[PDB]
Symmetry: D2
């Protein structure tokens, strides 16, 4: 498989490392800067530490353990040399091309003009697109796909959890909060942003912001369309997040132990192993940094009242779990 | 009225500043250190800034704008000279005397052998104590009371919210999470703690921890006994917290606009003004720092799914709002 | 006088507040966004708190306590209507126009094409310009000036300190470090930046970065040209910084007491009162937040070895002290 | 070698992990808590991640990858069973026994009454003690030593650096600052502390604090006695620190490149390899997290003004580099 990455940022760089480790042929990276900057950011990661490979930069390329990866600095995805380079899958991780096509550009440009076979959009699309969450609607992948969204980090945490709860107990409806690490969409100090909350100094506050992630479960689990909604609180941690899901279940005599038992068992099945995890250790968000699961249920936190009213907490490394899924998905598309 | 403060910490010092500004006669402070240290901590507050008063220290006292306050350093409260000093109300804000008595003392030592007329415990009691949340069960205050708890900051945020929702719509059940500033009960870096989550570096992680604050709503709103529970997430901000309440209401056609409507109305009443606030500004936690309200509904976040299943978010400065309540309560007691 | 602000950022908004309080006629603000965003950022400051004034927005204006300030969104400073509006002084605080002229624009555009009388550049110029540091070279202010740099925050801390030490003891040479709050020039998480140090997650690390602030002392104190250099360390605080100055003095038997005595005396002189402060309180960076001085000597930190080898530490709020100087300077120009 | 650790904290646990990897027999840990808490802290580290070994707790013991280690909970070190357990070297890392003896115990209790053969004090002694900095005064180690201090993390950074500079160029005098991670000696929010600056919320400020680390260089390099002094600034990072050394050298025509060349060359010698490191990458503090060097010169930062007046910066993980030296020292003592 020949991979290209468009947007060598937090997701782009984690995807790179995970894919490189698997022996995938990463042919080219496109961003808006020079090879020296990209090589330096790849080598030294504030969140995850020092990359253990030999990293160099050259004219038009970075070199990783002797493997040379082409660097492009092309703002307009229509202009990318993907056919020339024989690109099988483009990872679209710039954050700025979440419509199919546009005046400034769109994710379908990678396939329709630039000549790549396939594109994975690393964010929910603003329009209609095949959306996959691994462990949830894997079956929806076929060989003829040209464009797929891997949804959001939060949907990837929430959808597997909701799938198991719905299949076991039935969800009538649910509301959620993600208490969520800050990201590069936010601001270091107060500065203009179209979202007036995200305008605010990110390491100084708990910052409410809207999320479509709970509604988006309906795209991958149609039975739950219209049944889930929620909100997000951006807090001052650099990575690591937690979904806090409050559900009304159809099983009106459901207990804490029954909920934890089905979640534990589900995490051990071949369909969800490595995707849904379960723990009973009293951990904190730092403990999940670099964890490849989409969703790790904190069993100690499960809380149940009468009549199927329940709260489930599930951890995820919003960068690393999600990036592993993007690579998992790339390999399945081929 | 003569006030003494036992434990001149985050709560003790805020209570001091609020009471002093009202002209209350603050007779003495007891802690475990010298007057120079207490004067310095009073003068320079990392969270709220420099105290705009002349602060002096001397042998056995501090002086604030020419008013002398005695400093005591007695670890066992049974030994405190409250009768001799004529103390009407002792504020018990050490964090270590949350039982009535023990082989190392308790909050009743203040009103039994030490001889103060009354004690406010600035935390829920580990045993049973008369518990008051202003704006909610003011009627329970009578001149015969000796010992009262002002409950927790979180209960002070939640209970007024619950009161209004219950009176307007009826509350079937609800679950909550507080996304909560770190406190001095936590650890700067990983260090032993009886709570293995609170053992962890407080500025580095989202840290789940149990809370009795939702169940405690039942102490002050007896109709809601058994109907609420929840959890806490401690996050890296030094003050400012938010209650995220997910509630099943009895009014099945309730809308978000209706919910915001009754909360906004309640905020303007004489019973709840100064206690329950309401905003529709897209604020963040740093904006509620130093706000004296117990509970500030974030109107933009209100959300209803189907059939009375609703989500409501409310801000509180866990130090400052709560400390104002402690002073308000002391004044009501006499 | 009629003031305009170009770039309503950290400096721009603080300059606004300080100027407004002085009754200065702030005619217009230019930035890159709408009035609602600008009003919201003025009202709610993560660093400094809630602006206690009635702040409103309308089409092409914000209103503060009933006073209307025009809002413009014009990227090219050549196109600004300063002549039409009668602007006496423009504050150039976008950070992107530090050359007099350029293809994209420069600070002189405000006067030569846009028709304002005078411009203050809120940063060192990349070219030759009149550079003023109040308390250091005030006499260089003449009524015919069209363009002036107020230098940097760090030069404003360092220059008055160097002036006093040089006048009293003589500086042979000096090296310095500023331990400095992060700024909007930095990144919330690792992201491309022309400076590979400033590319890194700003709240996560100590970040060395170059500074010309010590060389720049030579612009306002010619006797110290070529005599000072230094470096910066950006650290995870949102404002508040400290100069750490290590100097070789000409007085070879100079003592800590003598150094502190001249600094304390200088801080009480008409020339430097409100510019250079001196303290002997054991404070930390939070305590200088919102302080209007350019430089506050930490007297307890003064350290002297043999032969005039001395170390002096001086605090500054890099936003607020500097912003106060910008407004002082505006008033001196007219 | 039989090792015991007294004080299983940040240093004690890092020492444990390093020693464990080397096959050192860790016989016993003493602290003030139970085995579950110590096992939990060992397994989950907020700073360094999840420990990749099976960790279990039982009565009076923990087990690490099948190796059993005794857990003791004895406050007074004179009562420790070191003779009975055959302890060769005790690591004294509680932070509360920095005097040889007192009415509450001291470091010599380990070797006098408790009956260990040797004790390493992981801090400068408050009284006189044989002090070793590896890479500097190794020759001072002999078989007759009963009690030694490994000095401080800052002395371990500064001393190897000063050694090379003095050998190559001669040091006349020097002054330094360490910009330094917070530690458990500090406070999460403002709280009493005998050091009024260390009393202040650790993650909210730059906090000046005194240090004997530069003067202590004279203990391990007698030619530099009385020639160095310095101060510390505690800043909001959990680990990772940097020494900023301003030094007057004897070679008056020395250049930045010359300084860097001797430092680079010294870092490759058998005496200093693994102790003194050298880089020319534009790194930040997060990048030295988990680095085992005592001192890593930041070559890009090296600066020379005139006449041998120079500035050198060197990184250190104050926890991990120092803890590696402690283990190195333990092995050299036997
Ligand atoms: N960070 C997370 O936790 C996370 C998780 C899941 C999904 N996502 C999604 O992934 C996407 C990227 O997120 P991120 O956090 O990596 O962002 P980021 O800001 O760290 O990286 C974006 C990168 O794309 C580059 N870029 C911008 N415009 C470009 C263009 N026109 N052409 C080429 N390169 C361009 C930027 O220089 C930058 O390197 C976003 O859509 C985000 O919503 C993020
Ligand atoms: N911080 C908050 O947000 C908050 C809010 C509501 C209630 N509370 C409660 O208020 C109490 C105090 O909390 P805090 O955050 O101010 O704690 P803190 O640790 O900041 O202050 C405790 C103070 O009491 C002193 N002290 C300890 N033992 C003492 C003794 N035996 N005699 C006299 N003084 C002693 C300490 O020296 C310290 O000054 C706790 O019960 C806490 O749960 C805290
Ligand atoms: N923040 C400090 O500590 C500090 C201290 C002294 C000097 N300065 C200097 O002041 C300047 C501003 O710094 P800041 O920290 O306020 O930056 P900031 O990023 O907070 O503000 C910059 C503002 O200018 C606006 N802007 C950008 N391009 C523009 C354009 N073409 N036209 C109109 N507006 C535009 C941005 O939207 C933003 O609102 C910089 O030159 C900086 O070096 C900063
Ligand atoms: N953290 C650093 O960067 C660093 C670097 C070099 C040296 N040091 C020194 O190492 C020592 C330990 O520092 P730390 O940061 O690990 O401290 P820490 O507070 O993390 O750990 C101290 C441990 O000792 C335990 N303890 C306290 N009193 C005890 C007693 N009487 N008996 C048994 N155990 C007791 C505590 O429970 C705790 O687990 C200090 O002397 C410190 O100055 C620290």
């Amino acid at each position: 498989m020949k991979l290209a990455i468009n947007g060598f940022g937090r997701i782009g760089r984690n995807v790179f490392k995970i894919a490189f480790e698997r022996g995938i042929d990463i042919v080219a990276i496109n961003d808006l800067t020079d090879p020296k900057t990209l090589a330096h950011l790849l080598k030294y990661d504030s969140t995850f530490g020092v990359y253990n490979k030999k990293v160099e930069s050259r004219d038009g390329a970075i070199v990783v353990d002797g493997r040379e990866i082409k660097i492009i600095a092309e703002r307009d995805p229509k202009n990318l040399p993907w056919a020339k380079l024989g690109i099988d899958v483009v990872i679209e991780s710039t954050g700025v091309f979440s419509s199919a096509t546009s005046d400034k550009g769109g994710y379908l440009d990678h396939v329709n003009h630039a000549g790549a076979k396939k594109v994975i959009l690393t964010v929910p699309a603003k329009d209609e697109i095949k959306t996959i969450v691994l462990g949830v609607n894997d079956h929806d992948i076929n060989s003829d796909l040209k464009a797929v969204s891997n949804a959001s980090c939060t949907t990837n945490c929430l959808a597997p959890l909701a799938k198991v709860l719905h299949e076991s107990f039935g969800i009538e409806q649910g509301l959620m909060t993600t208490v969520h690490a800050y990201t590069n969409d936010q601001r270091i100090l107060d500065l203009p942003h179209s979202d007036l909350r995200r305008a605010r100094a990110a390491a100084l506050s708990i910052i409410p912001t809207s999320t479509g992630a709970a509604k988006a479960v309906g795209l991958v689990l149609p039975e739950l369309k219209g049944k889930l909604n929620g909100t997000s609180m951006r807090v001052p941690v650099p990575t690591g997040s937690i979904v806090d899901l409050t559900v009304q279940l159809k099983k009106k005599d459901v207990t804490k132990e029954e909920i934890n038992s089905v979640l534990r068992k589900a995490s051990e099945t071949p369909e969800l192993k490595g995707i849904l995890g379960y723990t009973e250790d009293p951990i904190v968000s730092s403990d999940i940094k670099g964890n490849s699961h989409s969703s790790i249920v904190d069993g100690l936190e499960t809380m149940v009242l009468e009549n199927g009213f329940a709260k489930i907490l599930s951890w995820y490394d919003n960068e690393f779990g999600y990036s592993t899924r993007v690579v998992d998905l790339a390999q399945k598309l081929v």
